[PDB]
Design a binder for these strands. Structure first.
Length: 388
RNA sequence: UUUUUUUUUU
């Protein structure tokens, strides 16, 4: 509202004010209103700049609308508004996270071709894409390459590689790398410790994780919500749910405020244990304390109910889910498809795939495998061949 | 004023 008022008087809105606003709308979520602000400013004769483009482009990548981001990239190049190292960083990230690492490497080549030097963020972004694509190998290569270029690895560089190494099973390497970053002027942070803690929990070394938690508290590094979500998931997975609820209480007492992941993590643990009551209790409680269940909450509950054989209840939560405006995803659909299919409700399952395709959700491997399976033991085999 | 790392669901 302050905008109209500022206009009203004699203050001509800058491009930075529109950029600030558009960023706000792109974070707050509402993308299409951001686009609308873009058109409004274009109209008023205020020229969108390279920051305007980068902002919208980022927001479109993170709304899943990649190809639209690329439309905007095209458009900015048409206008002579030259993409900069940030434009390319944004797009490289967007491509890596949409499973198009090869195209990302393309943009990486191209920016150099245009006299744009990759910076520490470019490298961090690619080392992350590389790791998450299984290519630890290439990631470390890149880590050598950036030092060759005189670009100084930062905390994010080390955090990224510590994580990749953990995820590949190489806990010992991650630890040695942690030591290396300390032996340098790089002070680890909450993320370094959170990453290491997660790595220790995943490898079944929960007490080493708790030790490390003590050490970060000692070293003056305040644990955050992620720290506690990580230890809570570790305890639930280790089968120690009492202790996890204890840590939950404890974080509330330490002034850490549980978020949606805290609640999903607990709901998962309780569902997996078969304590579907306590789980539903926490679902209602989170809504009560005003923490909006997302798609993972409902997915988690639905899978808990299907696994218990409470199909009706599960389906019901799917309905309530939609009615609350919560948009399903491929996980929701794989879960119900799976559950229906186990129940000899292959027809409905197929219908669920139909709807899935009709709302604009990609089916993914598991969906394919699953509906093929169900089509088979049915048994309509030509029906499956045509479905693929 | 915009871009990179850690935790939860099939």
């Amino acid at each position: 509202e302050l905008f109209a008022e500022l206009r009203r008087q004699g203050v001509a809105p800058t491009v930075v004010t529109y950029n600030t606003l558009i960023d706000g709308l792109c974070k707050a979520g509402k993308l299409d209103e951001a686009l609308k602000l873009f058109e409004e400013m274009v109209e008023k004769g205020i020229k969108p700049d390279v920051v305007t483009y980068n902002t919208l482009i980022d927001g479109l990548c993170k709304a899943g609308k990649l190809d639209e981001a690329l439309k905007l990239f095209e458009e900015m190049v048409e206008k002579g508004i030259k993409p900069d190292v940030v434009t390319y960083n944004t797009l490289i990230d967007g491509l890596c996270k949409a499973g198009k690492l090869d195209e990302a490497l393309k943009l990486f080549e191209e920016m150099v071709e245009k006299g744009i030097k990759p910076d520490v963020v470019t490298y961090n972004t690619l080392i992350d894409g590389l790791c998450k694509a299984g290519k630890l190998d290439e990631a470390l290569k890149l880590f050598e390459e950036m030092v060759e270029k005189g670009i100084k690895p930062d905390v994010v560089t080390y955090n990224t590689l510590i994580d990749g190494l953990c995820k590949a099973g190489k806990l010992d390497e991650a630890l040695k790398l942690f030591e290396e970053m300390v032996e340098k002027g790089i002070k680890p942070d909450v993320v370094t410790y959170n990453t290491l803690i997660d790595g220790l929990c995943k490898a079944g070394k929960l007490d080493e994780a708790l030790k490390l938690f003590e050490e970060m508290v000692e070293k003056g590094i305040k644990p955050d919500v992620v720290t506690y979500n990580t230890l809570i998931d570790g305890l639930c997975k280790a089968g120690k749910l009492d202790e996890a609820l204890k840590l939950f209480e404890e974080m509330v007492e330490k002034g850490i405020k549980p978020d949606v992941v805290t609640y999903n993590t607990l709901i998962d643990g309780l569902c997996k244990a078969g304590k579907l009551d306590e789980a539903l209790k926490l679902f209602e409680e989170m809504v009560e304390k005003g923490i909006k269940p997302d798609v993972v909450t409902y997915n988690t509950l639905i899978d808990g109910l299907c696994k218990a054989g409470k199909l009706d209840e599960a389906l019901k939560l799917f309905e309530e889910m939609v009615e609350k405006g919560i948009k399903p995803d491929v996980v929701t659909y794989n879960t119900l498809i799976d559950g229906l299919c186990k129940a000899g409700k292959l027809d409905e399952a197929l219908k669920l795939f139909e709807e899935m395709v009709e709302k604009g959700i990609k089916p993914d491997e598991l969906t394919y495998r699953r509906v093929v399976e169900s089509y088979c033991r049915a048994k309509r085999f030509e029906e499956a061949r045509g479905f693929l």
